[PDB]
Amino acid sequence: KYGPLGITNFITPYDLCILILIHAHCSQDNGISVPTAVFLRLISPTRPSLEWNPLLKDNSNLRSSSIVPPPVLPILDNIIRILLDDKDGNKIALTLMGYLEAINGLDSINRLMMDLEKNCLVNNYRSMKMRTTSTRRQMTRASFLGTFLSTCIRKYQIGDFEMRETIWINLQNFKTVFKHTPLWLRFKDNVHIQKVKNCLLANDEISVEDQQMVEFFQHFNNGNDADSKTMNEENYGTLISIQHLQSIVNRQIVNWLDYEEQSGLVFDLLDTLSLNDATKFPLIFILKYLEAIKENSYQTALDSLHNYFDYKSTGNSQNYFHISLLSLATFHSSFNECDAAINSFEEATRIARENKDMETLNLIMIWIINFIEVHPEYANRFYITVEQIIKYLKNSSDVEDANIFSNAYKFETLLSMVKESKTAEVSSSLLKFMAITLQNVPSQNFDLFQSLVSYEVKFWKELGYESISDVYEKFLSKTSSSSLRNYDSSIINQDIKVAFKALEEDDFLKVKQYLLKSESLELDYDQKINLKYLRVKYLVKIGDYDLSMRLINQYVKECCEEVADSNWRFKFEIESINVLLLSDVGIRSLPKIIKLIDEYKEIGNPLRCVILLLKLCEVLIQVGKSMEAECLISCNLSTILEFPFVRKKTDELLESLS
Amino acid sequence: ARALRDISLFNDIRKDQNSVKYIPSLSAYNVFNEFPYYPTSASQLLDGKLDEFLMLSEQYKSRLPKIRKLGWNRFKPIGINKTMYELEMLRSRARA
Amino acid sequence: EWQLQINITNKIGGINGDIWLSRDGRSVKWCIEDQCLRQFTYNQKIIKAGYIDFEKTPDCFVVVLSDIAHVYMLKNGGSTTVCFPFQIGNAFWYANGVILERETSASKPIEFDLKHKYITLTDPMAPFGLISITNFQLVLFPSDKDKCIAVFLDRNSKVLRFYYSRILSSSKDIVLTEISSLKLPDDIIFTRLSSILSKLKFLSLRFERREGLLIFHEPTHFCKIWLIDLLPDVLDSIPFKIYGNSPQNMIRLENLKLKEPSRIQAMYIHELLESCLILVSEGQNKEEYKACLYDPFVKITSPSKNISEELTKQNSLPSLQKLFPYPETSFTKLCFEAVKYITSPAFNISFIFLWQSAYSILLSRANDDVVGGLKMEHDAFSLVLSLLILPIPSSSAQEYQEYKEIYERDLFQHLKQDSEITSSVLPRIVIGLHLIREEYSLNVLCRNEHALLGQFLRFATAAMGWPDLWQSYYVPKTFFHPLDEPPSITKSLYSITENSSIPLCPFISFSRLVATDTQVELRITPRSFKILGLYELVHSPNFLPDYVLGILSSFKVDKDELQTYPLGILVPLQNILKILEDKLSEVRDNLELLDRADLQRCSAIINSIRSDCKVPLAKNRSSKKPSDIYSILSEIVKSASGRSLKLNAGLIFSEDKRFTHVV
Amino acid sequence: FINRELATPYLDFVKRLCDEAYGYGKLKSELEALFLLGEISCDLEDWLCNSVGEKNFKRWKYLGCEAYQKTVQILTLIFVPACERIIIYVEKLRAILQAFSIQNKLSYTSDLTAVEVLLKSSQKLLTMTLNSIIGLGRDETLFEKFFIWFNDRLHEALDEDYKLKFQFEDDLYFGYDLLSYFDRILSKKGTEPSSIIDVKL
Amino acid sequence: WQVLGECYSKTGNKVEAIKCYKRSIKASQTVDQNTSIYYRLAQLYEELEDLQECKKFMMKCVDVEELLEGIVTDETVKARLWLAIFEIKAGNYQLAYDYAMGVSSGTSQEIEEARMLARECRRHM
């Protein structure tokens, strides 16, 4: 079924197949009505125009609410397999098969097309009711099939005889490809084919003289191979319109990003473009780019991106130069270049000002924090602080925003969490973002919906209620990851959870091997901290604390200046507390534990309050004053069983007291 | 693209609280006449991208009557000093 | 299929990374272990892959094509590309640059140039340089900065030329002077330049100031090593360089002291072990290959008899490199380093050999009892020294059977036959380990293994019959010992103290019995040296609590270093700082050792002024009704669509009603 | 409330306007013919003009939008906050009983199997609640695309001079969602009052 | 090579732009073409807060004018005006006086800037 591919603005052989089907359905002589699902799989990809920005926008409208079958490749083998499935589909399948056999000439093609325009297609409904004398079903222009057939009619009267010959030379090539196929052998003889073929072949007006030599014209052109064939220019094996190519490509990249498709056929066919249709179809370049990132090829990613943004900008009259840099900026942030991405972004701001268009500034601002969300360590380097944006976007407008406010509040929630604000405000801020996101369609805005889950899971986990987190985590998508953050980040993130479990099950060999990968990998900041946090926990289990103690303090000291992450500061502080008290000297930590207790009492996070209580209890029992420790733990035992993961520590301490 | 107003809730609250230049592309430029194609309507610009099929559709539609509208104006037969463009204008006044 | 590369980069010790080449010189993948990092494909043939530095402290990965070099910034930055005056045959890495040799011949006529075929470049942007040679294909160059010997072979002559190349920076960039020469064996016949170079193998080794070059040829089983001693006086001598005259003594050529040197499969440098030790692979049958270890400088070799058949392949090198064990934890590393500083290299290298063997045996013996951790190496460390000091039991003894596998090893036999080393070196090891335990006693965070040392040290005393004072030093209540009294940090510290009942006593550290500068002693026991220094200065009669800050700054002690002390030393010094928390208000430098932000911030402001750098603004932690769901949503949609100065004014002027009257 | 005020009134309007006027099975096939072919029977053209008309069409849109846009509000703004609160109280409820099982050390113990059932069931509700919100998000999409196309057909039947503003060219899968609405609104399962949400469950 | 530095200069990569122009200087066949490079290259040092370093390139650009029998080009006019300004801050009025008179054949604003400076240095001469 493979062959050279070329974009054609004329009637592709695939197109006639629908025209074959619609003829049988409207004729109503055979009583064969093609099922509606068949048409909606065939015509709909040919419906024009979808558009798909390279990055900076993911499936904002491409996702169909109902799952649709993949678009069909223009090969008789694939087309027939759709009709073939039904028990009576053989009858429908043979109807198509017979018509393709009856159509043996360019004139016969014209007979089909003249028939539809004169009788089947009709300008408007008001003439339906007057045409009750028609033995065939009549079509309205505005209908689903009507608008399609109008386009097909237009594409036939649009060209000279030069295009009509290409239709027939290609169709016979297209028809004969199916002939040397195993399925055609299964349908070598079906008697019904002759019946349907003779239905339309009738009224030939000659059977004795012209038919003797009519065959001679057909056969001589055809490759009878008795002699050397008539030499003709190389002809393409498959012809598709631009719009049909758009559907197959968009489905392929979406399927790749996260009823069976034919990846090999699509990829092979897309590799035979004459390099001119590639100009007419710039999206072929980016299809390599998405493939390029998968194997982590740097230069091969770059040239493709530059390739895509040169043909797109010229084709579209609106200035998209202000969009090219951001995609390139995303690409650099994808390879952790970071600093180079920074320079890329600044000149995007200047370009936006010259265009003097307001709507693009919202797009450039929204990209800022999305970048800083991945790399919070770069907040100081931007010319605008994060808080300025939130204040700006909160009062941006009251209309023509839709998703901006949903984006606006989530950034405040993240900042509010990191700034360790009081839980009352954080709950309210997340409330705003939750209400606005769910109010509109959440399925269509798949990116933000996932981000909501991540924040909520994180938020409730910090409060210590895994029961709530357990419900939400089932909605978190794995391996989906997000844009502008690498491509193997999901693999790394999954691996880290493995290491933590391995640490719990005392699999020191596996975790040890993973830390070796740590020092030479390019990792995101959030990933970096986890491994940085992973190492200190591992060193505690081994027993060496001189190295860890010098290591933990460096981490927390740099966890307060470079990034003002209070949550990660807390987790590191308590590890140091564990290190001290484990070495029989936790008394040094008494100043440190107390200053956090009253500090978090004001905050009101119960999980924080309880964990320090256990540490306070543990230090008091290694002193020899376990008497009062028992008294304190007795009064607070009720409120400390609410948190699951501390129960194991809480239970274990109980037998110690006995 | 709900614009925050297609949302029933926030739209309700707002009521209570109240109380493009075109530039040619390469494919637009043709080989015969150096004037580039100018699209007739914004429908022919597909998200700003000039659809090549619609462009050539209008081009065919313009040229098709051009063969028919040939004999108008300048061409004059001999023995008739009066071209056919005014043969129908007098013909129009004849019945009217 | 992908091919791995042996030496790609100069990183004065090595780098964690891999380079993969396709079946053709058209793709390069910088995968780490199993994750394909930056991958580069090219139409032309790929010559070599870099990751070397370019004298500007970059971390850039470089790939060389036939005539074009691509240099990709990995640490920071984008990409650069440079051209070349002519075609390049091969390129060799060297400290801060690359050496490029011209393509010799292509067709089948064979013609070549000899006047100048080598190009030196430091960084891509700067112009190239020309080599300098004084009284011929480059087979190997000293890529590592530490080694400084280059080897040249000329085809027709079939002789070697050894030079002493030194790099010149800010055109002549490198200069080479011949020292000696070696004649190839007649049986060695070489015939596609890389294929010619493939058969011969060369390795660069260096220890201390001795370096060795290993020359190997598998088809002819030819293996020789060229050694040189880098005497600072000899090298710096002007006649030595220009004239090339060399004395006969330091030049020496020797073979390997192996059982069957003619049956060597291949060899590699131990990446994990930075010393001269080299991997050696031997095969007695087509399905079994025995691996052993050998030291070039010291004739000591390791009987390992490690069997590995499929690991002999090149692309499986990292697995082979990871096959042999080394102490990875952070406790026995100091123990090994102390042994290195107190024992001969001959005894040293044999000790790792025995330790690695014992470590392997314990792995086989220990069937994953509970966890496996620091106790592992400590037990290995313990049993090795016990076997060294304990007399070998009779073959019928049960203890003989359990550790028989270590007894028959030649090194253990030699390491016990040697009367002198067992007579004197072992007590030195015991004393050094005792000092390590003393040092650990100053760091309260590591008391566990501190005790672990104790049992062994007690065992060591029992084996060697030291006076009961040493043995009683561990209980709460025939070699010759040099020290009659155990050295203790605490006893000496209490000696240097006011109102000290005990008389004056020095610590008699090992800095004198190591016969090396205190810089070496510093990196081993920094805590012991520091505390000794502090209380030597603090307890002076003319000491005042102001100088302690400069003292603390000068001894590189930080807050974390301060918080880890077994009471004692910590208590007064903390009180001393507490005293300085009161009377210090004049900004007197080195404020980071305190905990007051204002003084350090003011000092930071002042220092920025003096230089003419982080004006970290303090975020206002502001802080009440929680309200209801609807009210919040109404608030945000409603918001969707001087005061300080006046507040100051009410405070700037006060105590009267004058300002309102005048307004 | 939503069953009585939002779900039922919308469905009865649909049932009376469709089943009582034309019938379901005949409508579904004939509408598909209208969508694919534009064939309007004599009886259906009566149904658009007399049965539906302009007056009910605006009512239909007004009923439908509230039937979805208000439905999601009560699920997101009432159901989500309550389920989490139940979880918290249940979790605290479990902790209290466990402690006095130990602090009191009283010989008789009360089993906690009742609590954990509520915790699991409560957890099930929130997961079930979110699925509906996602589903109603899709339903709003299908609902709107139906009436924007239905508007063109209705006015065309009543004007014979209507200028079609909307174009099907805007979307490729505009056929699928439009068809997808019909089966949801016209089927035996759809005839049941639980068509909007699974009220019974 | 000249173009690359301008891009680097316009993107705040001044550390790179120095080496870029330095490569451009070697590739030029004739010294006279280097007159424009010298002035802008000197400016790049001025923004790198080291006035002493830029003096050496500043010497060369003006000296090209003498080596070209008094070319009197525009980008040396701005050179001589800046050199004389800095020399006043150096206290060497005599060494600044000859610079002003040599640039007295430039633009309308150039001649008045040097003429006033010529009076300033002749006052302290």
Side-chain angles (χ1 to χ4, degrees), chain D:
Chain D
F1 173 84
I2 51 175
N3 182 60
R4 195 192 37 90
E5 181 59 34
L6 296 183
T8 307
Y10 171 65
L11 299 182
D12 297 343
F13 179 88
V14 163
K15 187 208 186 194
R16 148 174 51 93
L17 269 295
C18 297
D19 198 0
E20 292 196 319
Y22 196 75
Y24 284 165
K26 189 156 38 71
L27 198 73
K28 176 185 172 191
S29 305
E30 182 65 26
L31 294 174
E32 293 295 330
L34 168 59
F35 163 62
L36 286 187
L37 321 177
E39 297 180 1
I40 296 172
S41 71
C42 295
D43 293 349
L44 187 153
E45 191 188 1
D46 168 72
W47 186 77
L48 276 296
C49 72
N50 291 316
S51 295
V52 179
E54 173 78 6
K55 65 179 72 66
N56 302 319
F57 173 75
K58 67 182 290 294
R59 165 93 180 298
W60 196 353
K61 189 164 186 168
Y62 176 72
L63 279 179
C65 67
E66 313 298 334
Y68 293 132
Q69 289 164 349
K70 295 297 177 183
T71 303
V72 59
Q73 290 173 6
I74 195 166
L75 294 174
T76 61
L77 181 147
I78 300 299
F79 270 89
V80 171
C83 295
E84 65 183 1
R85 283 164 183 274
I86 298 299
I87 297 293
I88 283 165
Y89 281 125
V90 161
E91 181 64 28
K92 279 184 172 185
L93 183 63
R94 184 192 70 183
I96 293 177
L97 291 176
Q98 282 179 340
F100 293 100
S101 69
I102 291 182
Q103 290 294 288
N104 290 123
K105 203 49 178 169
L106 188 153
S107 299
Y108 280 82
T109 76
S110 57
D111 200 359
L112 294 174
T113 180
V115 159
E116 56 88 16
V117 172
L118 182 52
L119 192 52
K120 157 55 183 72
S121 293
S122 59
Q123 278 185 339
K124 183 181 177 185
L125 177 54
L126 183 63
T127 300
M128 185 180 288
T129 300
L130 213 64
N131 288 338
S132 294
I133 310 169
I134 303 298
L136 277 296
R138 292 174 187 170
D139 286 337
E140 185 64 8
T141 61
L142 282 72
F143 172 88
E144 172 78 353
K145 318 316 187 273
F146 159 78
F147 272 109
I148 191 59
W149 163 85
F150 194 72
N151 173 84
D152 283 330
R153 313 279 81 58
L154 180 47
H155 285 87
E156 182 67 15
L158 300 190
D159 192 11
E160 83 180 2
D161 283 328
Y162 207 55
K163 300 289 98 175
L164 294 186
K165 314 152 169 304
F166 180 75
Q167 302 170 3
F168 303 160
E169 196 289 322
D170 301 333
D171 186 291
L172 321 183
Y173 293 97
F174 185 78
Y176 272 124
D177 61 357
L178 192 142
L179 191 150
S180 295
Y181 188 78
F182 287 134
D183 56 275
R184 174 178 328 282
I185 198 160
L186 300 160
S187 67
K188 324 207 171 200
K189 322 316 160 293
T191 53
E192 305 165 34
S194 63
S195 65
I196 302 300
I197 64 166
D198 193 355
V199 172
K200 300 289 94 175
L201 190 54

Side-chain angles (χ1 to χ4, degrees), chain C residues 255-294 296-298 300-304 307-308 311-312 315-321 323-339 341-355 357-364 366-404:
Chain C
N255 297 321
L256 302 157
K257 196 54 184 173
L258 272 298
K259 300 305 293 182
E260 308 154 1
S262 51
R263 170 203 295 189
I264 299 166
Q265 308 299 108
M267 72 291 291
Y268 302 103
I269 50 173
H270 208 298
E271 182 65 26
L272 177 49
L273 184 60
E274 302 170 350
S275 53
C276 60
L277 183 63
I278 50 171
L279 275 183
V280 173
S281 64
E282 196 179 13
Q284 284 204 336
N285 267 323
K286 277 183 174 180
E287 82 298 342
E288 59 209 0
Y289 297 85
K290 280 174 181 164
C292 63
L293 308 176
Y294 169 89
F297 302 111
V298 289
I300 297 89
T301 175
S302 164
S304 290
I307 295 93
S308 62
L311 303 199
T312 60
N315 293 296
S316 190
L317 191 147
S319 164
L320 181 43
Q321 184 67 217
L323 188 153
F324 276 92
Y326 199 68
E328 202 295 339
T329 61
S330 57
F331 160 65
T332 48
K333 276 195 180 67
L334 275 298
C335 302
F336 273 10
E337 196 146 352
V339 166
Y341 294 158
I342 204 57
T343 61
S344 76
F347 182 76
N348 193 11
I349 187 74
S350 53
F351 186 92
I352 297 89
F353 292 155
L354 277 185
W355 177 93
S357 183
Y359 183 88
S360 63
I361 298 300
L362 285 197
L363 294 174
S364 68
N367 73 340
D368 192 10
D369 300 335
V370 175
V371 164
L374 193 145
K375 60 184 179 293
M376 294 177 71
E377 62 258 36
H378 194 30
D379 291 330
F381 193 31
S382 85
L383 70 91
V384 175
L385 295 171
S386 77
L387 293 174
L388 292 175
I389 195 53
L390 289 173
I392 300 179
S394 59
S395 56
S396 66
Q398 273 178 316
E399 303 85 7
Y400 188 90
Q401 280 100 55
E402 67 159 38
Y403 289 161
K404 194 187 324 295

Side-chain angles (χ1 to χ4, degrees), chain C residues 422-476 478 481-518 520-524:
Chain C
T422 66
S423 61
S424 74
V425 180
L426 289 169
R428 309 202 95 148
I429 298 168
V430 170
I431 293 153
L433 270 297
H434 165 73
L435 291 175
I436 293 298
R437 188 184 173 280
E438 290 293 327
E439 193 265 6
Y440 281 168
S441 85
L442 271 74
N443 197 359
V444 71
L445 277 296
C446 54
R447 64 163 69 258
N448 192 13
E449 61 269 23
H450 172 273
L452 268 298
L453 285 183
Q455 293 82 17
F456 194 13
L457 271 64
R458 185 179 296 113
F459 180 77
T461 59
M464 88 167 298
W466 270 8
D468 53 337
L469 179 62
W470 286 77
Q471 307 169 40
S472 72
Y473 183 75
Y474 303 160
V475 176
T478 73
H481 61 88
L483 285 200
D484 297 19
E485 294 81 4
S488 176
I489 296 293
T490 305
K491 181 179 177 181
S492 295
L493 274 169
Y494 192 49
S495 174
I496 173 176
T497 302
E498 83 173 9
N499 203 324
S500 45
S501 64
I502 57 179
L504 277 296
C505 180
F507 174 68
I508 190 68
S509 168
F510 73 109
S511 164
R512 49 207 53 87
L513 61 83
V514 65
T516 317
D517 46 28
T518 187
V520 169
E521 188 264 341
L522 172 59
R523 59 179 179 266
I524 306 310

